[PDB]
Design a protein around this ligand. Structure first.
Ligand SMILES: NC(=O)C1=CN([C@@H]2O[C@H](COP(=O)(O)OP(=O)(O)OC[C@H]3O[C@@H](n4cnc5c(N)ncnc54)[C@H](OP(=O)(O)O)[C@@H]3O)[C@@H](O)[C@H]2O)C=CC1
Ligand SMILES: NC(=O)C1=CN([C@@H]2O[C@H](COP(=O)(O)OP(=O)(O)OC[C@H]3O[C@@H](n4cnc5c(N)ncnc54)[C@H](OP(=O)(O)O)[C@@H]3O)[C@@H](O)[C@H]2O)C=CC1
Ligand SMILES: NC(=[NH2+])NCCC[C@H](N)C(=O)O
Ligand SMILES: NC(=[NH2+])NCCC[C@H](N)C(=O)O
Lengths: 308, 312
């Protein structure tokens, strides 16, 4: 010790672990007070040069705590996790976590879809076409009997047909769309996976009530839906204690639209321990993720056990 | 990269660096805005098992930032406390060094209070008192000893009454002007500067029981709301602290005073950034002068940055 895993060895070990299971237990653990999730901490660099966010989690059940540090350098973004023993207080592992973050962000949203979407939903829509979108598809594809998967990204119109093959070769049911409108037609679940700062979708412009997931974070107060729309949705989030205070749309809505965090109907720990209100679909249903360091300390712990 | 430094290499690299200078410039850097010092974060472990504190700094001027993580693990036989620092580049956002900082912490804690003493104590003070006799007090002594013409140095700690003859000599051999004492009372007599370096949870000294007004430094942090002086006595001192924006919100005495005794953080007359950039009120000695340190990550990142430059 301490072992230093870089990108290569990380991807390798990331392929050998069951992320959804790791996460499912984590949150259950979280709910039970066997895991602690401090708020994230953003620290600005001087001279507009950028920032970094640190993420914590404590996994007492595994006897490890850690920190993930993620700097935005002006447009360079990285992620590095340091895992520490809760027994001898020594470092166990330092791990490049570029890929582990993509995984856990997708898997985390997957657990929301499995718990929140109608059991017999059939239509899926996916906005954004980068790795997080990609990864989103892989972790949600087998969660319901999807009869149609549409994704759409501005770039795709003028896209290399080869790259399209890569996308189309992630699920045979998937077809590339031409608009955001088209993709989310008659959709039951709509997974916003963009880097947008601003709304990529208005919920009250949907044909029918749908589950709407959002993961956008890398922008001051970034949001993927109109902040005012939260007042006409059934709002969920990864974690109730921390995310409402940092999620762009929730901040904007409470400051301007009369929205109150107390409206959040449930979070992952509550849903996955049967202590949250499953929603009707009399109104759209929104789930917000911004990441959570438990997600990051669980993954890095997983790699460490294998490392060992 | 990233090079991993364990204890031995750390102490040796530590031995080859001017902690005081690095730190002085650091705080000047702080004051200019070329360096950022976020508050410290404390996260409790479940089931009374302990906690950890993280410390941040941004050293834009050195092109790096970092985190120092310090856990307190409660083991029945004893409490384990450690310190590890991770230093990240602000250019490529890659890790540059991961470094055991058990001793770097000791250094920086001593050197910091040193800068307060060089900035706050009379130019012609000649009496020095040291409470606590651990490595932290010992380091304070080696960083404050050449700062004035000391005519007498006294340290006291409860263990010293009945200790290894030779142990005494280890300490004695740090300064020829030093003497051990049999009480805290005895050590602080006619004291110009009194450097509390203990692990006490509660007061080891009432400043209103001193013969004359002195500079009184404090470091104790290892306890919930730990304090080395009565909280109420701050309302009758000229209070300084390492950094004004953070330390008042977490320091025990200051918390308790503001809660119970009508004290108000606005009272803090200055911090090290201000002092060392000439925008703080050096005080008179009509009242005792108090300086509070609780550690600040920028100190940790500076020192780690130093080792990394040598390592390179
Ligand atoms: N919640 C969490 O834990 C995390 C969240 N994130 C957030 O998610 C993003 C990660 O995605 P990633 O794939 O890595 O980044 P990319 O930039 O590679 O992909 C983002 C995609 O979103 C699409 N997009 C951007 N704007 C719009 C719009 N107005 N309408 C429709 N689609 C749009 C882009 O399409 P085009 O190709 O046309 O640009 C792009 O393909 C980050 O920007 C971050 O904000 C990231 C990490 C963790
Ligand atoms: N502000 C900062 O930046 C930092 C502060 N600290 C604080 O300082 C301590 C670290 O010092 P360190 O030397 O390593 O710890 P040690 O436990 O090794 O030494 C503590 C010393 O304080 C003395 N002491 C304890 N209680 C009393 C009392 N009631 N009256 C007089 N003396 C007393 C002890 O004497 P005896 O031997 O007789 O018990 C001992 O010599 C930690 O407890 C922590 O709270 C630590 C690191 C950084
Ligand atoms: N503003 C920043 N420094 N962000 C870094 C990117 C954070 C990224 N979404 C993560 O959770 O790893
Ligand atoms: N309660 C804790 N976990 N404290 C960690 C030790 C703090 C120590 N004074 C340092 O600066 O390293």
């Amino acid at each position: 010790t301490p072992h230093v895993i870089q990108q290569a060895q990380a991807r390798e070990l990331l392929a050998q672990i069951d992320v959804p299971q790791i996460l499912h237990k984590l949150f259950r653990d979280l709910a039970a007070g066997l895991a602690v999730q401090p708020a994230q901490q953003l620290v600005a660099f001087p001279k507009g040069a950028g920032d970094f966010i640190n993420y914590l989690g404590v996994l007492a059940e595994d006897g490890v705590y850690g920190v993930k540090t993620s700097p935005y350098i002006v447009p360079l973004v990285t992620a590095w996790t340091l895992l520490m023993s809760m027994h001898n207080g020594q470092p166990l592992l330092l791990c490049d976590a570029h890929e582990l973050t993509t995984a856990r962000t997708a898997a985390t949203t997957a657990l929301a879809v499995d718990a929140l979407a109608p059991l017999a939903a059939r239509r899926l829509a996916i906005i954004g076409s980068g790795k997080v979108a990609q990864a989103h598809l892989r972790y949600v594809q087998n969660l319901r009997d999807w009869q149609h998967i549409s994704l759409f990204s501005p770039s795709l119109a003028s896209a290399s047909p080869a790259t399209l093959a890569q996308l189309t070769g992630l699920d045979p049911r998937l077809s590339i769309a031409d608009s955001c409108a088209a993709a989310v037609a008659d959709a039951d679940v709509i997974m916003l996976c963009t880097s947008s700062a601003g709304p990529v979708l208005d919920p009250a412009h949907l044909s029918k009530p749908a589950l709407i997931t959002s993961i956008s974070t890398n922008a001051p107060r970034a949001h993927e839906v109109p902040p005012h729309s939260l007042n006409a949705m059934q709002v969920f989030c990864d974690y109730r204690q921390t995310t409402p205070d940092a999620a762009g749309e929730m901040l904007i809505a409470s400051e301007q639209h009369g929205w109150d965090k107390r409206a959040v109907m449930g979070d992952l720990p509550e849903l996955l321990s049967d202590m949250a209100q499953r929603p009707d679909y009399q109104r759209p249903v929104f789930f917000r993720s911004i990441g959570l360091g438990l997600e990051d300390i669980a993954l890095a712990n997983a790699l460490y056990q294998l490392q060992r």
